[PDB]
C-alpha cells in the first residue's frame, strides 16, 4: 500500500509538470507559427518588389 | 557611480575577447584573440610603420603578418602578446583609461596558480588599474542563469569543460576538459564539404565555411535516423550563396559536424564525448550532490549554440542516469555571452565591492593576495 | 545676422535664476510647514501625557500603553518594510536606466561619505574658516 | 501556461510564510514584558511615562518612515518618466 | 604627481593651510604620511569603524607612489575629489528639490502651465511669450513637458 | 491498497499520453522556429540585395 501510494504521488506530480510545460510549448508554438505567416508574407512582397526593380 | 559605471568586464578566450562595462547587457567589444606581426617592411597609405596588429586588423591583413594566438586552450601561453590584446581592449576598443576603472577578468577552470598571480602582476603593475578580480568562467556562466549549484558544460573556440559547482565553489577534482571545440569543428566541416565535391580555395572561401557552420549547422536528436532521412532525400537540404553567386548546397553534413561533439571518433579523437563527459564529471562528485547537478546542466559557449543540442543532451544523459533522477539541461539564448553577462551582473552588484582586490591589498600583500 | 539674439538668452538665465531663487525660498517654507503637520499629528495621537490618580489608574494606563506599544511597533514595522520594498523598487529602476543611458544624474540611493567640510570642522573645531564650494581665488587688487 | 500555477502557490505561500515569522521574531525581541506589576505605587509613575516615551518614540519613527515612502514614491514616478523618455528605440 | 598639480591648483593657500593642519593631526609620529593605522585612529575619532580592507582601499585611492601611505600631496588630491563630489551632491539635491516644488501635481513633469505659474510666481515681470519661449528652449524632446533630465540641463549653470 | 493502485494506473496513462503529444508539440515548434530563422534570414538577404539594386 505505502509504496503504491508514494510512487503514485510521484506519477501525479510528473504528470502535472508534464501538462504545464506542454501548455507552454504549445503557446510558444502558436506564437512562432503566427509570427511566420507574417514574415513569409512580407517576403513574397520584398522579393516581388525586387524582380521589378531588377528588371527596370 | 565612482565604480558602478566604472567596472570593466573582460572575458579572454581562445578565439574571441568579450569586453564592456559592468552594467551592460552584452559585450561592448568582441574581437579575435590574435596579434599579427608583419612579415615584411612597408606601410599602408597614410599610416606609419606598425610593429603589430591586434584583433580584426590582424585578421583582415593576415596575408602580410604572422598571426599568433596568446591563449592556447583557454590558458595564457604568451604574456607579451596577451598584454598587447589587453592594451588594445582598454585603449582602442573601450577607449577608456584603465587607471581609473576596476577590472573583472576571467580565467579558465584549472588555471595554474602562477598565472592568476601573473595577470594580477600585469594588471596592477603595468596597467595600474585601481582594483581587479579574476572570476572562473563556468562559475560566471552558472550564476548568470540565476543559480549557484549546477554543472556547466562550457564550450568555445579551443576548449570544452565540465565544471561542477556547489554553492559557488567549483569542484576541482570533478572538472573535465576536452580539447575539441568550435575551431576543430569548422575544420571538420571544411573537409566534409570539400568531400561533398567542393573547393575552398581562396581565403574568402576558407573564412565563410565558419559562417556556414554557425548559420546552417544543427544537432539532431536521433542522428541515426537522420542520415537515413538524408538518403530518402527530403527537403532537408540547404543551399547557401557564397561571397559571389556560387550557390553551394549542404544537405546532410549540416548535422554531421555537431555529431562530432558526441562522437570524437569522427575526427580521430579517442576521448569520450560531451554527454558521457557530463556524466562522468557527475559520477566523480559526492553522492548527495548528484541530484542537484543533474537537474542543473547549464550550457554556455559559442559551440553549444547549435540548435537541438539541448534535446540531444537531454536524452543523452537521461538514458545514462538512474531513472529515479531528474535531468534538466538549461541552455539560454544569450549563451555565447553567459560568462560575460555573469561577470557584468556580479561586478555591478551591490555586495561585490568588498571582494575587489585593491592596489592597497596588492602593494601590501604581493600577487598572492588575489590568488586566494 | 541676429546680433541682438544674445540678450534673449541672458533673459532665460535671468528668469531661470529668478526661478531657482524662488524655489529655494519656497523649499524651506514647505519644509517647516511640513514639520508643523508632524507635531500636530503627534499632537493628538500622543498628547502631553497626564499621569492619573494612584491606584487602578496608573496600573491600568500602564497596561493601556504597553499594549499600544506592541500595536504601534507592529505598524512601525510594517511601514519600515513597505519602505524597504519601495527603496527596492527604485533601486531596480535606478538600474533599468543605468544600462540604458549610463551613469545618470541624481541616483536615488546616493552613496555619500562625510564631506571634507565636515571632516575639517570635526578636526579643527574652532579654526575652520573657509566656506568652500568651488570659488577659486586669484589676486584681488 | 497552467503548469506554472503550482509555482504560484509554492512561491507566494513560501515567501509570505518566511516574512511572517521573521516579523514575529523581530517584533518579539523588541518586547520586554510589563513584569513590573505591584512592586511599588509611585513606581507606576516613573514607569508609565517611560512606556509613554517609548510609544511616542515608535510613533514618531512610524511617522517618518511614512513620510519617507511618500517622498520615495515620488522619486519613483520621476525615475519612471526618465526611463520612458530615455527609450527612443531609434 | 600630475593630479597633485591641478589639485593644489584648485585649492587656495587658505585651503592648503587648513588641509595641512588637518593632515598633521592625521599623522601621529609626524613623519610625513598617514599609515594604515594612523588613519584608523582618526576615522574612529570621526565616528567610523573601518576594517583593514576598507582602510587600505581608502588609502591606495590616492597612493600614486605605491607607498601604502598618504603624503600631504596625495592627501590634497583626496580632499579635492571629495570637495568635488560634495558640491555635486548638494547641487543635484537642491535641483531635485526644486523640481518637486515646480512639479506639484506630481506627474513627474513640468508643463507650460506650471512653468508659467512658477515663473509668474517670481517677482519678475513676464508675459506669456517669455514663458513659452523658456519652454521651447528647455523641452528638447519636444513633448511639451520638462523631465527631470531636461530640468537638470536647463538649470545647468544658473547659480 | 486496491483503490490507490487503480487510480494510480489511470494517473500514469494520462501522464504518458500528456508526455507523448507534448513531445509532438515541441517537435512541431522546433521545426517551425527553425523554418523561420531560415525565412527571416533569407529576407534580410532579399531586402539587402534590394536597397543595393535600388541604389545602383
Curated annotation (Swiss-Prot), chains A, F:
Point out residues bearing the modification Phosphoserine: 38
Q: List where in the cell it is found.
A: Cytoplasm, Cytoskeleton
Portion of the parent chain present: 8 to 63 of 284
Give the top-rank taxon of the lineage listed in the UniProt record for this protein.
Eukaryota
Q: What is known of its domains?
A: The molecule is in a coiled coil structure that is formed by 2 polypeptide chains. The sequence exhibits a prominent seven-residues periodicity.
> Source organism lineage?
Eukaryota, Metazoa, Chordata, Craniata, Vertebrata
User: What protein family does this chain belong to?
Assistant: Belongs to the tropomyosin family.
How is this protein named in the record? Tropomyosin alpha-1 chain
Question: Basic and acidic residues bias: where?
Answer: 5-31
Describe the function of this protein. Answer: Binds to actin filaments in muscle and non-muscle cells. Plays a central role, in association with the troponin complex, in the calcium dependent regulation of vertebrate striated muscle contraction. Smooth muscle contraction is regulated by interaction with caldesmon. In non-muscle cells is implicated in stabilizing cytoskeleton actin filaments.
Region Disordered: what ranges?
1-31
Quaternary structure and interacting proteins, as annotated: Homodimer. Heterodimer of an alpha (TPM1, TPM3 or TPM4) and a beta (TPM2) chain. Interacts with HRG (via the HRR domain); the interaction contributes to the antiangiogenic properties of the histidine/proline-rich region (HRR) of HRG. Interacts (via N-terminus) with LMOD2 (via N-terminus) and TMOD1 (via N-terminus).
Swiss-Prot record, chain C:
List where the protein spans the membrane.
none
As for what it does, the entry says:
Troponin I is the inhibitory subunit of troponin, the thin filament regulatory complex which confers calcium-sensitivity to striated muscle actomyosin ATPase activity.
Q: Does the keyword Acetylation apply?
A: yes
A biological process term (GO) from this entry: cardiac muscle contraction
Assembly and interaction partners? Binds to actin and tropomyosin.
Modifications the protein undergoes after translation, according to the UniProt entry: The N-terminus is blocked.
Q: Which gene encodes it?
A: TNNI2
For this entry, the protein name equals: Troponin I, fast skeletal muscle
Full-protein positions shown: 4 to 144 of 183
Source organism of this protein record: Gallus gallus (Chicken)
Q: Which family does it belong to?
A: Belongs to the troponin I family.
Q: Where is this region: Involved in binding TNC?
A: 1-45
Residues annotated as region Involved in binding TNC and actin?
94-114
The entry's cellular-component GO terms read: troponin complex
Q: Name one GO molecular function term.
A: actin binding
Curated annotation (Swiss-Prot), chain D:
What fragment of the whole protein does this chain represent?
160 to 249 of 263
Q: Which GO terms describe its molecular function?
A: tropomyosin binding; troponin C binding; troponin I binding
Q: What is this protein called?
A: Troponin T, fast skeletal muscle isoforms
Question: Biased-composition ranges for Basic and acidic residues?
Answer: 18-29
Instruction: Please give the biological process terms from Gene Ontology that the record holds.
Output: regulation of muscle contraction; skeletal muscle contraction
The question of whether Phosphoprotein is a record keyword is answered with yes
In the record, the note on similarity to other proteins reads: Belongs to the troponin T family.
Task: State a GO cellular component annotated for this protein.
Answer: troponin complex
Q: Which UniProt keywords apply?
A: Acetylation, Muscle protein, Phosphoprotein
Tell me the domain of life.
Eukaryota
Q: Function, please?
A: Troponin T is the tropomyosin-binding subunit of troponin, the thin filament regulatory complex which confers calcium-sensitivity to striated muscle actomyosin ATPase activity.
UniProtKB/Swiss-Prot annotation, chain E:
**What SUPFAM superfamilies does UniProt report for this protein, alphabetically?**
EF-hand
**Entry binding sites for Ca(2+) 4:** 139, 141, 143, 145, 150
Q: Which residues form the EF-hand domain?
A: 14-49, 50-85, 90-125, 126-159
Q: One cellular component GO annotation, for this chain's record?
A: troponin complex
Which positions are annotated as binding Ca(2+) 3?
103, 105, 107, 114
The alphabetized list of GO BP terms reads: skeletal muscle contraction
Q: What is the effect of changing residue 127 to I?
A: Decreases calcium affinity
Q: What PANTHER family does the entry give?
A: MYOSIN LIGHT CHAIN 1, 3, TROPONIN C2, FAST SKELETAL TYPE
More about this protein? Skeletal muscle troponin C binds four calcium ions.
Q: What is this protein called?
A: Troponin C, skeletal muscle
Organism, by scientific name, is: Gallus gallus (Chicken)
Question: Its gene?
Answer: TNNC2
Amino acid at each position: 500500500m505505502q509504496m503504491l501510494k508514494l510512487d503514485k504521488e510521484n506519477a501525479l506530480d510528473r504528470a502535472e509538470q508534464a501538462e504545464a510545460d506542454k501548455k507552454a510549448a504549445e503557446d510558444r508554438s502558436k506564437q512562432l507559427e503566427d509570427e511566420l505567416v507574417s514574415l513569409q508574407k512580407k517576403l513574397k512582397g520584398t522579393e516581388d518588389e525586387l524582380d521589378k526593380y531588377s528588371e527596370a | 557611480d565612482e565604480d558602478e559605471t566604472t567596472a570593466l568586464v573582460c572575458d579572454n578566450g581562445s578565439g574571441l575577447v568579450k569586453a564592456g562595462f559592468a552594467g551592460d547587457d552584452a559585450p561592448r567589444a568582441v574581437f579575435p584573440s590574435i596579434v599579427g606581426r608583419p612579415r615584411h617592411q612597408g606601410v599602408m597609405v597614410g599610416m606609419g610603420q606598425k610593429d603589430s596588429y591586434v584583433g580584426d586588423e590582424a585578421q583582415s591583413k593576415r596575408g602580410i603578418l604572422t598571426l599568433k594566438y596568446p591563449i592556447e586552450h583557454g590558458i595564457i601561453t604568451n604574456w607579451d602578446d596577451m598584454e598587447k590584446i589587453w592594451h588594445h581592449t582598454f585603449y582602442n576598443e573601450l577607449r577608456v583609461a584603465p587607471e581609473e576603472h576596476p577590472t573583472l577578468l576571467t580565467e579558465a577552470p584549472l588555471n595554474p596558480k602562477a598565472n592568476r598571480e601573473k595577470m594580477t602582476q600585469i594588471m596592477f603593475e603595468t596597467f595600474n588599474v585601481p582594483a581587479m578580480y579574476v572570476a572562473i568562467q563556468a562559475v560566471l556562466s552558472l550564476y548568470a542563469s540565476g543559480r549557484t549549484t549546477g554543472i556547466v558544460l562550457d564550450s568555445g573556440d579551443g576548449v570544452t569543460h565540465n565544471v561542477p559547482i556547489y554553492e559557488g565553489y567549483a569542484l576541482p577534482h570533478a572538472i573535465m576538459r576536452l580539447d575539441l571545440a568550435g575551431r576543430d569543428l569548422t575544420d571538420y566541416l571544411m573537409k566534409i564539404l570539400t568531400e561533398r565535391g567542393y573547393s575552398f580555395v581562396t581565403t574568402a572561401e576558407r573564412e565563410i565555411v565558419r559562417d556556414i557552420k554557425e548559420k546552417l549547422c544543427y544537432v539532431a536528436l536521433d542522428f541515426e535516423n537522420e542520415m537515413a532521412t538524408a538518403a530518402s532525400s527530403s527537403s532537408l537540404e540547404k543551399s547557401y550563396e557564397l561571397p559571389d553567386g556560387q550557390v553551394i548546397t549542404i544537405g546532410n553534413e549540416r548535422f554531421r559536424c555537431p555529431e562530432t561533439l558526441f562522437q570524437p571518433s569522427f575526427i580521430g579523437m579517442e576521448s569520450a564525448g560531451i554527454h558521457e563527459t557530463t556524466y562522468n564529471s557527475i559520477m566523480k562528485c559526492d553522492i548527495d550532490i548528484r541530484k542537484d547537478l543533474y537537474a542543473n546542466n547549464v550550457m554556455s559557449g559559442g559551440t553549444t549554440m547549435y540548435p537541438g543540442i539541448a534535446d540531444r543532451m537531454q536524452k543523452e544523459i537521461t538514458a545514462l542516469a538512474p531513472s529515479t533522477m531528474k535531468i534538466k539541461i538549461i541552455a539560454p539564448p544569450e549563451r555565447k555571452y553567459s560568462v560575460w553577462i555573469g561577470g557584468s551582473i556580479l561586478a555591478s552588484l551591490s555586495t561585490f565591492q568588498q571582494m575587489w582586490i585593491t592596489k592597497q591589498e596588492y602593494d601590501e600583500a604581493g600577487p598572492s593576495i588575489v590568488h586566494r | 545676422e541676429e546680433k541682438k539674439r544674445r540678450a534673449a538668452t541672458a533673459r532665460r538665465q535671468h528668469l531661470k535664476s529668478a526661478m531657482l531663487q524662488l524655489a529655494v525660498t519656497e523649499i524651506e517654507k514647505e519644509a517647516a510647514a511640513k514639520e508643523v503637520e508632524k507635531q500636530n499629528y503627534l499632537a493628538e495621537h500622543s498628547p502631553p501625557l497626564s499621569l492619573p490618580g494612584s491606584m487602578q489608574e496608573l496600573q491600568e494606563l500602564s497596561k493601556k500603553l504597553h499594549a499600544k506599544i506592541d500595536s504601534v511597533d507592529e505598524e512601525r514595522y510594517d511601514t519600515e518594510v513597505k519602505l524597504q520594498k519601495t527603496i527596492k523598487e527604485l533601486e531596480d529602476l535606478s538600474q533599468k536606466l543605468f544600462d540604458l543611458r549610463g551613469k545618470f544624474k541624481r541616483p536615488p540611493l546616493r552613496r555619500v561619505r562625510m564631506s571634507a567640510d565636515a571632516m575639517l570642522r570635526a578636526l579643527l573645531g574652532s579654526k575652520h574658516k573657509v566656506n568652500m564650494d568651488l570659488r577659486a581665488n586669484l589676486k584681488q587688487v | 501556461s497552467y503548469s506554472s500555477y503550482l509555482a504560484k502557490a509554492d512561491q507566494k505561500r513560501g515567501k509570505k510564510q518566511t516574512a511572517r515569522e521573521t516579523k514575529k521574531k523581530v517584533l518579539a525581541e523588541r518586547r520586554k514584558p510589563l513584569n513590573i506589576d505591584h512592586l511599588n505605587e509611585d513606581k507606576l509613575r516613573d514607569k508609565a511615562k517611560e512606556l509613554w516615551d517609548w510609544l511616542y518614540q515608535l510613533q514618531t519613527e512610524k511617522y517618518d518612515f511614512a513620510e519617507q515612502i511618500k517622498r520615495k514614491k515620488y522619486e519613483i514616478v520621476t525615475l519612471r518618466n526618465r526611463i520612458d523618455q530615455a527609450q527612443k528605440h531609434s | 604627481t600630475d593630479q597633485q598639480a591641478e589639485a593644489r591648483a584648485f585649492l587656495s593657500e587658505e585651503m592648503i593651510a587648513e588641509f595641512k593642519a588637518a593632515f598633521d593631526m592625521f599623522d601621529a609620529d609626524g613623519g610625513g604620511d598617514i599609515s594604515t593605522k594612523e588613519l584608523g585612529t582618526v576615522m574612529r575619532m570621526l565616528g567610523q569603524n573601518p576594517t583593514k580592507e576598507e582602510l587600505d582601499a581608502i588609502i591606495e585611492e590616492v597612493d600614486e607612489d605605491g607607498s601604502g601611505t598618504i603624503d600631504f600631496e596625495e592627501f590634497l588630491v583626496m580632499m579635492v575629489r571629495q570637495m568635488k563630489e560634495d558640491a555635486k551632491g548638494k547641487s543635484e539635491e537642491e535641483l531635485a528639490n526644486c523640481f518637486r516644488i515646480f512639479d506639484k501635481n506630481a506627474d513627474g513633469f513640468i508643463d507650460i502651465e506650471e512653468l508659467g505659474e512658477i515663473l509668474r510666481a517670481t517677482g519678475e515681470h513676464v508675459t506669456e511669450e517669455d514663458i513659452e519661449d523658456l519652454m521651447k528652449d528647455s523641452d528638447k524632446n519636444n513633448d511639451g513637458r520638462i523631465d527631470f533630465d531636461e530640468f537638470l540641463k536647463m538649470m545647468e549653470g544658473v547659480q
